[PDB]
Structure 1
Amino acid sequence: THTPRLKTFKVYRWNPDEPSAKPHLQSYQVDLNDCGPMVLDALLKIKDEQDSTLTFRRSCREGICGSCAMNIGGRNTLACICKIDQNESKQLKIYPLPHMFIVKDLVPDLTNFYQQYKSIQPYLQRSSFPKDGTEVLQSIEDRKKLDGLYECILCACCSTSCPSYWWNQEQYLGPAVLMQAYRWLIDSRDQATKTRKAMLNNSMSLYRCHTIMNCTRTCPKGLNPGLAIAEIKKSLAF
């Protein structure tokens, strides 16, 4: 009854127990009828019913942990939100995140990214709390300023699409870490900002941005890490 339609996925491959080989692209034919409407539902059917040497990261299938972010069909996006077009005449190319030292197949080494998130000090730095032991006070129009900043999931689909982070990624902090350096500047209860605005005032940590905004274009959660850099620059001068 159900005549099978066949799309052809083209997945990047490497195997670090034979590093003399070159990374290549391998073709898998997936029966599109008994498969889910997303790409992670198609990359898990390959691992179950075909070659299970394929490795990748996945945790929730909803889009909130940021663990299966790859380069699907040309742009950086999350593989459990990206939708297969039901048109079985064209192919699909799945790559890892661009310009990262990859580990096995589609897993990049995000170790330099976790040492740069540690260094903007992501914790509150007050010095005094109210006398009857209750919470600190904050009005609604100061709480409105954080909307669009605290809800980043740390996927690095913005950092690894920025040509300045493709070359100087060992000293430039990237658009993902420079937005979270700004979530702690404009918090109304964070009374030490003379030090937060002093580790960014060197030659290349904030000023290797040229406003070529691939970041705001490719964030899958719909945030704006390109506007949130251009308020730090407007504050470090003024």
Structure 2
Amino acid sequence: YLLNNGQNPPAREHLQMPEQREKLDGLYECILCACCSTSCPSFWWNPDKFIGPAGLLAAYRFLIDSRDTETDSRLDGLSDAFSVFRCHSIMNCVSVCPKGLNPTRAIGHIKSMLLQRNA
């Protein structure tokens, strides 16, 4: 869910230039059909520790949402050895997604924001 600290409230709705909103495409569409996660070995081995493709797309969904202000907080929360890094780029997720979404591309971004923040 969105996490906005409310600092600098908007008059009516939130400031969102199409360029930014474009960033949510391929992320807010997931239907939680559980196809990908269900097709990922890393998930079969650590269902409870590794977040999986569907969640990682969701994680990324709020990481790049102009309206979400806890980006740094969310990032620290994913910096353990299992949450994100169990992904080995096998790609069955992309391979099967009914809605044509790409979890691996999103995960690679999340990983990139991680290096940026903790390296």
TM-score with structure 1 length normalisation?
Answer: 0.47
Higher helix share: 2
Partners of 2:44 and 2:70 in 1: CA distance: 32
Matched to 1:201, the amino acid is S
CA deviations 1:120-143 (Å, max 9, x no partner) are xx233232312xx31121111111
Q: Please state if 1:209 is matched with 2:87.
A: yes
Secondary structure class of the residue paired with 1:204 = coil
CA deviations 1:148-202 (Å, max 9, x no partner) are 1101111110101001101111211111001100000101121111111011101
Corresponding residue pairs, total: 115
Aligned to 1:160: 38
Aligned to 1:177: 55
Partners of 2:99 and 2:18 in 1: CA distance: 24
Aligned to 1:61: none
Identify the match of residue 25 of structure 2 among 147, 162, 168: 147
5+ long unaligned stretches in structure 2:
none
5+ long unaligned stretches in structure 1:
1-121
Aligned to 1:223: 101
Matched to 2:70, the amino acid is A
Aligned to 2:111: 233
Aligned to 2:6: 127
Question: More relative contact order in 1 or in 2 (CA 8 Å, sep 6+)?
Answer: 2
Matched to 1:147, the amino acid is D
Larger Rg: 1
Secondary structure class of the residue paired with 1:229 = helix
Q: Is the 8 A contact 2:28 2:61 kept in 1?
A: yes
Correspondence list, 1:10-25, <5 A: none
Higher strand share: 1
Q: Is the 8 A contact 1:126 1:189 kept in 2?
A: no
Q: Please state if 1:191 is matched with 2:69.
A: yes
Compute the RMSD of aligned alpha carbons: 1.1
